[PDB]
Ligand binder design. Sequence first.
Ligand SMILES: [K+]
Ligand SMILES: [K+]
Ligand SMILES: [K+]
Ligand SMILES: [Mg+2]
Ligand SMILES: [Mg+2]
Ligand SMILES: [Mg+2]
Lengths: 191, 76, 97, 120
Amino acid sequence: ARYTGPKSKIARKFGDPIFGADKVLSKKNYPPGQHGTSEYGLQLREKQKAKYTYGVLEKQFRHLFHRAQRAVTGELLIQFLEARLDNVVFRLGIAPTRSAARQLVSHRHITVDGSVVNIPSYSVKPGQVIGVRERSKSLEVIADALTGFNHSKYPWMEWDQSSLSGKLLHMPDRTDIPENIKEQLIVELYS
Amino acid sequence: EKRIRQTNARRLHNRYYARTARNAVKAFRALTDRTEAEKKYPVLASMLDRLAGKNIIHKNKAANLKSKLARRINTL
Amino acid sequence: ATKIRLQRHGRKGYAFYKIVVADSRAPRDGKFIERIGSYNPNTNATIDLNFERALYWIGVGAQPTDTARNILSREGVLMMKHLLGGVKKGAFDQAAA
Amino acid sequence: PTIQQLVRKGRESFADKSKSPALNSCPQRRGVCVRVYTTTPKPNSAMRKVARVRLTNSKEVNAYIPGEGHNLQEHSIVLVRGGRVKDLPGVRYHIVRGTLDTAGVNGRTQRRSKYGAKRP
RNA sequence: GAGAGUUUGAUCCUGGCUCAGGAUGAACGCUAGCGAUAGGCUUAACACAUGCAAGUCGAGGGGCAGCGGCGACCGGCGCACGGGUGCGUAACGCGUAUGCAACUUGCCUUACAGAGGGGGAUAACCCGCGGACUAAAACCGCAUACACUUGUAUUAUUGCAUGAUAUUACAAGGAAAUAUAUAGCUGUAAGAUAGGCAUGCGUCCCAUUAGCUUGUUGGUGAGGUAACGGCUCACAAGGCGACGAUGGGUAGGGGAACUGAGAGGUUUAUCCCCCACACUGGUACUGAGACACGGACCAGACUCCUACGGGAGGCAGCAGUGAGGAAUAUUGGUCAAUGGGCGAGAGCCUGAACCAGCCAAGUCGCGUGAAGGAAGACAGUCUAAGGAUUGUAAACUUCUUUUAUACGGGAAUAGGCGAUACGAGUAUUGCAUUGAAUGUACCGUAAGAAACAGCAUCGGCUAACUCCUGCCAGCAGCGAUACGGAGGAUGCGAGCGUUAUCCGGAUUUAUUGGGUUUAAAGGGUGCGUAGGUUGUUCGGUAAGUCAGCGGUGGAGCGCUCAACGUUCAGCCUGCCGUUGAAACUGC
Ligand SMILES: [K+]
Ligand SMILES: [K+]
Ligand SMILES: [K+]
Ligand SMILES: [Mg+2]
Ligand SMILES: [Mg+2]
Ligand SMILES: [Mg+2]
């Protein structure tokens, strides 16, 4: 399933702008509810923060966690979360937000190594090419997010605008990923 | 019905020759004269070997019976 | 009799066969005497085969099925005609073609 | 004990008893309401509705009726599950609401699946 | 490789109990979109009706009444497999490892020899359950085989006791299938395959189960068996037991699977190997092989039909139905693939098997939209403010998915030309139940798609109204930041909870790894049998112990991803055989 609910409530609950920029981040910024903590509370807040910022449900999150444990566990769990089709598409800037990237991947618009992959949880190994569909290179929504913005602030993406593709050089280290997540709390909770 | 008829006919056929051979060995087992035993042995051995190669009885059974009768006639 | 046959060891919609030597009375996916290879008809068909053991069993007299006979016709297992010393002593090389 | 004592005698392990022995290792059983009566709790002072039911496994037990408002009566076929009441000696089983003769609680809008009430 | 609560006015121990976790061929309540891949009477070896499930050969024979081929009969092969069930069985039944110099083995392969001569019935057919003639690859002699069996030897060689393997001889005896080059037939041997018997070790409780056995233990002889043997039949007396005989109760046994750091443990749901069985018993018969699963005979239930003289079935094969139960599905399609049986082949058959249908349904994956839009109306809590809330409403795009259309793979591979005259290697031919099924493509649309539990502590989540009994609970308990509703919140999410069962925390059986003054726990005290333990030292041995050598039993690839399939690196660390070592235990 998917959350498909109100996003500003989660944004005001967690304080951080996980989904992006909004006026409610500065106006009326407090946890939701007309009525609005133990270490269990903070650990649950951290785990739910990761889940909401990456669009992952509980069973998939647990599978990711113990896969990272089998193969610092909290350190590489974050890069496992980052290495996802929707997340990589969003970080390449070709889609505005992670939900938009997930919808674009789920629809027939994104190819991996020349073959269209529409599973928005496909792990992307290093040295792989992710590109827009050749039949969808001329969409009105597909171009304003990539062209014009042109952030390119991540030293593990190669963009190559002349082909509309993209490549992942290697898994970034835990310090270079701009996510305010304490993996020690999550690994302690799941331990 | 065909299986029943075949089994009955074959049972009667096997019983005929098996009983004949058994009676032959029983009659031979009461012999006393050495020359009579010598001149009665070959036909009985032939009948037993025919039964064994004819699958009414077993080859080892025929060999055992022939060995017993030969060892008997070797001692009068 | 002893046979050379294929057991369906795979998944629904993806048939993967194991080439074994087994009695004719045994079940299809049950007991076998020796495993001699694999077979996959889904590709464009990858065949694994123990040449020496297949030759030994076809020499002692295991009867192969039709598909296993075709698999042995491929990979040149039925070269027993050439290896029977048919008024010669050398070994020909037809594998290159 | 000594090693030889353990070799001669060994260790004996008991078996834990089942908290619902009348179910005969079944999740639910079927019974008929032999009697429907009311009992008093062992510092509560309430009037708890209970039914004596003879189960199909040749056993008679007492089953509590949860909720407010029961349409059951004598000689009613009911479904009996495990679960005991702390402040009531005796009874150790519950009656499933909304199954067989037992009806769901009317006017329920919360905890509906525990009392067999459909969505309004 | 971890914990929490709970005995008190308050402590520190001991000890049980209860929660928290993980897993179900589970059931129930509420609510349900799709795809893939698993699974599906756990209750009784319960009853029913119908159909199918084992046939094939006209290159075996007599016939054609049927247009070429075949109804039926005689004959060959198969039906002992595949499939189903766990009653019975503490047993060489099973697991592991061996032995048979005490064994058998159709079909298959290879090697060596041979297929020569004859005669009776009899089915069907015909004529009325009776009468007569018919053919063989049906049946049975005769000829031959010294490769086989039996008996007597000689020459040996060599073992593990009874002996075994070969030669060189004499004697007796034992086979066949021919048909239209192919398909074949017989004897012998080797191989392969499958069975049989016997062994070492392991294999549940009860001593409120202490003696058991009289072919029982052994010897001689005989018979019988594929084969040794009290297996059976005509002296000595024994054998087995506190290392548990005997008797009673309960189980099919293993690998798996689940689950514990380990020690291990639980259970055989799917899968594989072995065993037992086919309404209940007894006997066999036919066969290479029988507990004979769609074969007999007899004796017992039970059930059904006659037309009262007589006959049928066993639903532990696959599917309907009824009952039992908390609970588990179609009287479906095809032999296209794999595997079987028969056939020279073509081919025929296959409820095995491939598939499909049904079932919250175990697991995995996806969707129910994506980016902006200020603080509408309607709910709450305070006459304004705060929560719902960027939430709705419009305005801009996208189609995974649903629908309508088209293209539509893969699963399907199997006449000459060397020539050894036949193998074998090369062309061609049809062949898909699934099936509009994957996949690909085309319009016009957010359009068709979210529940359940709990929010006073343990624990994540709080205002107002009811009640003040009705009620709720896993515990501290409340009867309300605990009951019922309304608003918000927090989990999870096509699921969420309740019940039932099993493991870990539990060290709550403690070898690893607990205790006995007062919490449970030293016998009233001795003597002593079996058993357990053994000061110091010098040598032998090799039972325990140690070592070596043999035999046996994570990285990829494909699923668009994943569950899942599949391959190799990697344990075999259990058992057995064979060589060595001598510090310690034993002798
Ligand atoms: K192919
Ligand atoms: K036979
Ligand atoms: K077939
Ligand atoms: Mg799911
Ligand atoms: Mg005391
Ligand atoms: Mg004392």
